[PDB]
Design a protein around this ligand. Sequence first.
Ligand code: HEM
Length: 464
Amino acid sequence: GKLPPGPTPLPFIGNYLQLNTEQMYNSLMKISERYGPVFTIHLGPRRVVVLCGHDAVREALVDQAEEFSGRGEQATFDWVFKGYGVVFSNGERAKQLRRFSIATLRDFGVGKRGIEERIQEEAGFLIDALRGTGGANIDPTFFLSRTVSNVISSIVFGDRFDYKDKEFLSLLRMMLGIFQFTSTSTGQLYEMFSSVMKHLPGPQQQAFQLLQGLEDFIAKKVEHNQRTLDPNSPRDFIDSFLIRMQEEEKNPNTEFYLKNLVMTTLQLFVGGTETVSTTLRYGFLLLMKHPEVEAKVHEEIDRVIGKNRQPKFEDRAKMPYMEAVIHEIQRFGDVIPMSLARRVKKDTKFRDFFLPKGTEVYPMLGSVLRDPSFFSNPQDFNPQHFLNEKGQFKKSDAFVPFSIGKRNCFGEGLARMELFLFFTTVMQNFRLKSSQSPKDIDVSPKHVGFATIPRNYTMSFLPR
Ligand code: HEM
């Protein structure tokens, strides 16, 4: 009949003195060693229940999926979202908007053919862009992010952005800037002291201008769609949401208004871009550090696909090792370590612990991906974690970078496709060369907070 144990919290500051804001994951894992896998931390005034290891996260988010179905809080993001949009909402907003969004993604591709060809075409444009560097030593960041973003930008804006559009570069800078901030010390300090810091000068204010610029843009692209709309023929996601908005103009109790559109669209545009981009950027660094994996990936491509035709999604089933590399890239990468905070919808009983209504939950996706029970060498990049003795692909229940449950990533279909069609096509046409010897390439993250971000590196893409 008691809430999980945890260190003694001082008023307002919580467990600030017992935690390091630069390495929140390490700080929570140190406390897991004393108080067990399910403990209570006070991030300032924010009472949070932290779940560590697979069993804890799965038991809570899957077995008791309905009880842990509520959405928590991410203070930097909730500065511009304020509970609006598909991602940061609860109840009838999170049920209506999650329903509409998954639907409106299938009717414009996602998981089908309409998006597979659209990703293949875009993959062919990344090939051009990298062949256009003439094998010069470059920063892959914006080359990869440009490609990735255009896939989701097709669904939400109608068409793709052109690689030279300076507003596009500016929007991608905004997306990288916030994923950088929320992963820094000041970003994680902001999760504790948002109520004060929101009004104080600093790095939090610059990050806000990045979110405002992103919101300003979506509102601009929505207004255009309004005065140029075809009510019987929707061009994109904004257009389909604009149809429903009118079919609800008579319902005062609707969740389909202008504010929820600007937000749902923004949330997707960022959530589709920066997540898959970070995974790609970390991926190529992991491959340069390990030539042996690149070589076997190359062997599988030469054998299965060839040097001619552009790889297609269905080739994945005839390609076991490749799927295992992408899986280990996502695992080691740990793109979003502490998920996107959950909240218990009603008073719960979880393993002899009481969690009152409204209690924020932190599912540590990283501790599940780095679980020593489900993985042989959780600290190393070794695709064999997802590969049995006969070289076949082996699944794992601890593989959760997309999370699990009732509020999981409904962009998993698009994300896994993008990663297969971008990694493979680049690996077929190009061989990777670093700037330094593989024994020196640092694979440890530069920042770990909301997101896990790799180090700033440079490389060259040489043809085959
Ligand atoms: C490698 C890529 C990706 C990773 C690691 C990832 C990660 C996550 C995670 C950890 C969550 C929270 C799940 C939870 O409730 O516990 C989430 C939410 C979500 N993701 Fe992704 N994601 C990825 C790609 C995508 C893509 C491609 C899209 C866009 C189509 C997207 C759409 C969203 C949305 C809209 C949510 C909120 C769902 C809800 O509140 O019901 N994600 N993502």
